[PDB]
Write a protein that binds this ligand. Structure first.
Ligand SMILES: Nc1nc2c(ncn2[C@@H]2O[C@H](COP(=O)(O)OP(=O)(O)OP(=O)(O)O)[C@@H](O)[C@H]2O)c(=O)[nH]1
Ligand SMILES: Nc1nc2c(ncn2[C@@H]2O[C@H](COP(=O)(O)OP(=O)(O)OP(=O)(O)O)[C@@H](O)[C@H]2O)c(=O)[nH]1
Ligand SMILES: Nc1nc2c(ncn2[C@@H]2O[C@H](COP(=O)(O)OP(=O)(O)O)[C@@H](O)[C@H]2O)c(=O)[nH]1
Ligand SMILES: Nc1nc2c(ncn2[C@@H]2O[C@H](COP(=O)(O)OP(=O)(O)O)[C@@H](O)[C@H]2O)c(=O)[nH]1
Lengths: 410, 423, 410, 423
């Protein structure tokens, strides 16, 4: 029933969303066995969508270059580089119709439609302008249905004098438009892991992308197939979203370790219950130790002593009592689900609504008022409409959350 | 003869109920009766309405089945994966599958002359079976007013399963009372995930473990007093004894001879070795503490052949203890009922058969305690912001609460208008 | 002529009133022989009446399950549990018409109609709400005729939070409505006998019911058939009822003894004249030694020295001169009547209007004002009309007798 | 010739009466007379009104009979099992069978010229024959005023038979006097259940035992003086001697030769060996004590051939005793009457035949005593509450008493207006 219509748009988005289906290992036959194949029939319900021709890269490559192929979107020849207005007002509003023609001739497919978990990386107008559009285009059409998004925030590092003033015009609605619920990654945090903790003298996208997938899957398919009891893709948005202007989830795997005779507690059962709850292992990197979490979901993976897990998960819930709002009676729930990944023997998966992501927000906030307002560079969007504001009413929004969030962070 | 109807709405209920007609294996109501309504008139003249909102948990009966099937037709079901926003299942969705259920019921509750009765197996704290029944009854009470209603609503577990959960109870009780139900047996999962872990060992008390135990108790009530035999009872005469004022008072349940199999049953427990554990806290349902509250009733239910002359032997011993204590306006006594019928246990599921079953029923003004704390994990958030916007963006409200917090407040209010003074 | 129209209503009333006709042993032919068959032709004039289906139990069972069968009352399917309002305002006002249709097509039957001795047990609405209704329904219709009732008072023991606040709304008229005369048993006293005196480690209803019948018969059929001279069912109500709001009779057999070589005076002729006149052998248990008796009837059974009996009966009348009102010139009369029972060789039968039953009244009186007034539990009757009082104007009645009775008890 | 009519209303009377025409076996008035009215004119020209209110005691004559039957027709009867509330039988019921009885009587009391007379065999203290005759007479006196009336009313027995019984006499006498009856012979069962237990042995004096004895005396009066023969009398001349003032004074009766059969009659008792026992207390009717009272009459009745010259022999001896004593306004003498006719005894029933029968009649102002004590077991209760409400809820009253207690009080009043002084 949790018929999930997986969306995957944008070049530097498909690349991640792709090798995700690489992580979803159960192939096309040849395999609990009481499977919960949510989405569509035995061909990824995925609906890849790119502005340029990036739907091919490793997309239609070595991994699984067969994502329902005869549906893929490109339109045939186009562009849309790093111009939001582009792919959300222009060279995409061409494509939309195309997509909003194949997702529907895909969404439907009898079984009750879960919603749409749309993948992409905020601040890159190709598929983070096309997609942020899709949303407001899948929305106000499928109100009822719950929408999801695994948006990727442009590392504070700063690529492009534009890979930044970008997305700040997204969390201007990617939180007031269909997005009842959306996890969020911070490339910053990703370098830092392949550096500040895990090894790697440099993170090949074949590095600063691994976790990106062994983290989604660690929240996707689980809380989905058999394991302990069940779960769907929506009772969540009601236990993890205390408010309308919701809050962005701060995902966070755990057993990352590094090579070596990984004896760092050698994945001790209680380790998972520490190897995870820290910014040294969070996918948004924002000192969780800042504000409390209005809620938090856990997802222990790899069959092991369920005792220890509730003995440990409450532990810290009984530990940093300084970081759990404490006006939301039982702001936590564990989840244990049998069948493990491909190399951990044990593994967890953070999913907390911690008011710490605040940082990962007032960032893409003190760059706009501190640039696109401090003066300009916006004289690159007006080309495609966008005259004047639309960058200030957009600044009079995502900037808000500072306050909003700061109101419970306390 | 005169059969009361039962309707279990909601996984927690479906699962429970599901494991009760399994316990209701106590005698004739099994063999070649499949579609054979004929013969004797009881245990179910066709041993019945299963309405869940999640076509699946309630699907381990027909499609895929589950070791059995009563009558493919009496198990209403939808598609809407779930809900979990009370309104979301009490209004919106509910409003859809509420006329196939109310129709089916009537077209069941209206078979073979003389109705009288409705045992609604519940479970609150999670829409569907928390919000859809809040309506079921609002309906039934509209077309069976003259009929009584029981409800074994399963109380949430401090092991806290879900947030927004606490708050259902409240926007639930508020009308799932006066507007229906004369009696209602609060379970409180907390209890069992504790007792079925202590008196029954068991490490991680699986739902069935907890169902093979809330299921026994239910027999030692409904069943325990719903098949003539010898000393008997009538549903009409269930409140008359157990139900002080219209304020639907929730009687507290307590089973006593609980023994696994792997440990010593001690050959037996004197018919009084039991009726004290039967008075031991940890053997109750609602994790209360009648240690601070004047019973307004109290009536034992022994089961499996027992001679009165030995019963009072403890009803005595106890009396000798300055504790307990009643109120005033009630003859500080009992109503003790004995069943000769032996206590039915199942293959590893019930764990060991007893010689003597004992399960009483008293409504101590102390349940109010473990019953308003559930009002704290609500006055808490649901007063200072809370997930209130879902019970909106999926239905009406904005006082769906509060408005429905006073009467559910006036409760611990009433529960003292029968405990603070000599009136 | 003493055409007695025996009434028997209510489940836990038929049961007793039944095995009474078990006690009336003279069967259907095969037997002073100058018989006084009062009531009806050779089929119990009895008119069994139940709200539920209890007219069958042992009723139409092993004993004599042939009580004119083709007349019995049930209506067919019904209820009326422990709700006075029920069976006297509701689920019975249905039946009444049925009964007050078959008693009449029975009462009449040529021969002058004695009256109606209605059996039942106060406080149980089935047939102690139906019957208490029948009365007011047989009354104000058959004024002339004298009515009788063998009401059973709910032992102070207290069954049902309701087998108590019940009857207290009966003696609210079961003494101002047809009942010119009515004997009265107290289950309390019954346990106590099968305990405090007679043996029995527990009294099966097949115990706490025996006396109930070997006591009625011991007042019924005697003072009826041949024996010494005669008697009817009405000159009584004129020698035993000094006042309108009359007084309830406190019946009391005697030769109860117990098993064993009953040599306790081995039923000495003067024993009956003691084995009886005491609360250790009274069916109401109320320390007769309280107030004097306004009157008292005796009924010595089992042919023996009539001399000793008047020599003994006056004896105590000349004995406890402290317990015989003494403003009622000859407040006693004996009765001797040949043919004995089935196991005594001698037996008496108390029938006194002793102001001691006062207790067995101010009991079912300090429970109402001490409950159904002390607050409530009445919110179970209003369902069926009965709003407000009707429990207080009823409390402003049976509570009276206290005073009334206490006015000669002295 | 001139026959006086007799009417016995009420079991106590019927039974008595019933055993008198059995004693009235003294000569011609038995054989083939059944419906043979012809012949001589006396003993009953058809040896008659039996009216009871309980069709049964008065049924041991016709239906089932009882060794005999005079004339199936002269025994009026009803259905109303009884009564026993004076009003209940004097008013209510009475009023019904009082015109079949008053019609019958007139249609008997009006046969063969020259009437003169009515011997009403009574018995008071029990409605029917206690309350219905209170009316019978009120009627007769209305249609036979010029005719006299006698009544052997059976007085209640201290062995006290019935309560509410004492009080009948009073609400009875009050009008069953002036408004009728010139004479009336009080019996007082107490007497016999004492004498027929002493002078006649007998343990438990059965009604018939007491009837075969109140029946003898009656002969030795009515009969004793109602068939010409030798020395005679007229009903008219029954009061002239025995009846001082219109205040119906109740003459006291006393029979003397009473001997069973199992004891020695002594061959005989001198015609004077008798007429002293005849003056012995225990041989009277009303258990009085003329030991304190001035006779206003006194006149012997010897029976069975006796020569006067021997009688006065004791009328003397006695005289020689300072006791006795009369009043004033009366020649302190006698009126002695002798009957040659022998004393008729029956088979075991009368017990032994005498040689000389003796039964006198004096109205001592002492009967007032055992005659007002019956006013005590009345002024007792019937003044302080008593069973007064039945003589209401079954007819009128509320002073049916009191109002009728004064004249019945003024009696012991009058009984001194002829005893306290020299007037
Ligand atoms: N007593 C008892 N309670 C149960 C059982 N299973 C679940 N519950 C309780 O029911 C709730 C858990 O509900 P879930 O399984 O999360 O959801 P659901 O009832 O299917 O959800 P809805 O369809 O929206 O009603 C908690 O309050 C549990 O304590 C069971 O077998 N017995
Ligand atoms: N002399 C006499 N008195 C009797 C006899 N039988 C009963 N009595 C007394 O007369 C009274 C009995 O009256 P009942 O026969 O009861 O009544 P009743 O007035 O004759 O007529 P009912 O009212 O219809 O019964 C009592 O005082 C008895 O003690 C009898 O044979 N002879
Ligand atoms: N974590 C992660 N971030 C990526 C990846 N590819 C691109 N990005 C991010 O995407 C931004 C630049 O590329 P993107 O916006 O995806 O390009 P577009 O698809 O053409 O709109 C930067 O902020 C990068 O951090 C990837 O594989 N992993
Ligand atoms: N004397 C007597 N009382 C009984 C018997 N069975 C039940 N009772 C009592 O009768 C009392 C009055 O109510 P009940 O008789 O049950 O009412 P019913 O069901 O309408 O006939 C109850 O308190 C019972 O305890 C019996 O066999 N004899």
């Amino acid at each position: 029933m949790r018929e999930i219509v997986h969306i995957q748009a944008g070049q530097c988005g498909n690349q991640i969303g792709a090798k995700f289906w690489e992580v979803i290992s159960d192939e096309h036959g040849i395999d609990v066995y009481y499977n919960e194949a949510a989405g569509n029939k035995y061909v990824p319900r995925a609906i890849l969508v790119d502005l340029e021709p990036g739907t091919m890269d490793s997309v239609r490559s070595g991994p699984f270059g067969q994502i329902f192929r005869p549906d893929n979107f490109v339109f045939g020849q186009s562009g849309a580089g790093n111009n939001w207005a582009k792919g959300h007002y222009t060279e995409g509003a061409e494509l939309v119709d195309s997509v909003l023609d194949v997702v529907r001739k895909e969404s439907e497919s009898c079984d009750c439609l879960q919603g749409f978990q749309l993948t992409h990386s905020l601040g890159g107008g190709t598929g983070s302008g096309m997609g942020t559009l899709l949303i407001s285009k899948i929305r106000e059409e499928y109100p009822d249905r719950i929408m999801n998004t695994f948006s990727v925030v442009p590392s504070p590092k700063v690529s492009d004098t534009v890979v930044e003033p970008y997305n700040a015009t997204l969390s201007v609605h990617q939180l007031v438009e269909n997005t009842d619920e959306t996890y969020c990654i911070d490339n910053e945090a990703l370098y830092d892991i392949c550096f500040r903790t895990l090894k790697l003298t440099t993170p090949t996208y074949g590095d600063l992308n691994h976790l990106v997938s062994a983290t989604m899957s660690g929240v996707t398919t689980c809380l989905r197939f058999p394991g302990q009891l069940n779960a769907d893709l929506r009772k969540l948005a009601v236990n993890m979203v205390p408010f309308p202007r919701l809050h962005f989830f701060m995902p966070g795997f755990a057993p990352l370790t590094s090579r070596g005779s990984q004896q760092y507690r050698a994945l001790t059962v209680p380790e998972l219950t520490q190897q995870m709850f820290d910014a040294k292992n969070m996918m948004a990197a924002c000192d969780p130790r800042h504000g409390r979490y209005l809620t938090v979901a856990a997802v222990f993976r790899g069959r092991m002593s369920m005792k220890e897990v509730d003995e440990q998960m409450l532990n810290v819930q009984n530990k940093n009592s300084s970081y759990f709002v404490e006006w939301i009676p039982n702001n936590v729930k564990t989840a244990v689900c049998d069948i493990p990944p491909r190399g951990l023997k044990m593994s967890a998966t953070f999913i907390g609504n911690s008011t710490a992501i605040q940082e990962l927000f007032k960032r893409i906030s003190e760059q706009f008022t501190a640039m696109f307002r401090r003066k300009a560079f916006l004289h690159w969007y007006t080309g495609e409409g966008m005259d004047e504001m639309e960058f200030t009413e957009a600044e009079s929004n995502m900037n808000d959350l500072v306050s909003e969030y700061q109101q419970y962070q306390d | 003869m005169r059969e009361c109807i039962s309707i279990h709405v909601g996984q927690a209920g479906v699962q429970i109920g599901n494991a009760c007609w399994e316990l209701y294996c106590l005698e004739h109501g099994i063999q070649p009766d499949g579609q054979m309504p004929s013969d004797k008139t009881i245990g179910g003249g066709d041993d019945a309405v299963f309405v869940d909102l999640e076509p699946t948990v309630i699907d381990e009966v027909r499609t895929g089945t589950y070791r059995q099937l009563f009558h493919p037709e009496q198990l209403i079901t939808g598609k809407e994966d779930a809900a979990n926003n009370y309104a979301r299942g009490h209004y919106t969705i509910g409003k859809e599958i509420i006329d196939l259920v109310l129709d089916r019921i009537r077209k069941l509750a209206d078979q073979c002359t003389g109705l009288q009765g409705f045992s609604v197996f519940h479970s609150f704290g999670g829409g569907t079976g928390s919000g859809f029944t809040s309506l079921l009854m609002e309906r039934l009470s509209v077309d069976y007013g003259k009929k009584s209603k029981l409800e074994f609503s399963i109380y949430p577990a401090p092991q806290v399963s879900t947030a927004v959960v606490e708050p259902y109870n409240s926007i639930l009780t508020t009308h799932t009372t006066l507007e229906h139900s004369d009696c209602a047996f609060m379970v409180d999962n907390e209890a069992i995930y504790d007792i079925c872990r202590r008196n029954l060992d068991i490490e991680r008390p699986t739902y069935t473990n907890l169902n093979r135990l809330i299921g026994q108790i239910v027999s030692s009530i409904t069943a325990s007093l719903r098949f003539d035999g010898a000393l008997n009872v009538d549903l009409t005469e269930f409140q008359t004894n157990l139900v002080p004022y219209p304020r639907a008072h929730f009687p507290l349940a307590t089973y006593a001879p609980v023994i696994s199999a792997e440990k010593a049953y001690h050959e037996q427990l004197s018919v009084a070795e039991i009726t004290n554990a039967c008075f031991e806290p940890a053997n109750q349902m609602v994790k209360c503490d009648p240690r601070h509250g004047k019973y307004m009733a109290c009536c034992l239910l022994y089961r499996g052949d027992v001679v009165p002359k030995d019963v009072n032997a403890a009803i005595a011993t106890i009396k000798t203890k300055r504790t307990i204590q009643f109120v005033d306006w009630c003859p500080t006594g009992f109503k003790v009922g004995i069943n000769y019928e032996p206590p039915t246990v199942v293959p590893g599921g019930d764990l060991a058969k007893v010689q003597r079953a004992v399960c009483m029923l008293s409504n101590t003004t102390a349940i109010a305690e473990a019953w308003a704390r559930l009002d704290h994990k609500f006055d808490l958030m649901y007063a200072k912001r809370a997930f209130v916007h879902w019970y909106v963006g999926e239905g009406m409200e904005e006082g769906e609460f509060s408005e429905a917090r006073e009467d559910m407040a006036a409760l611990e209010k009433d529960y003292e208008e029968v405990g603070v003074d000599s009136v």
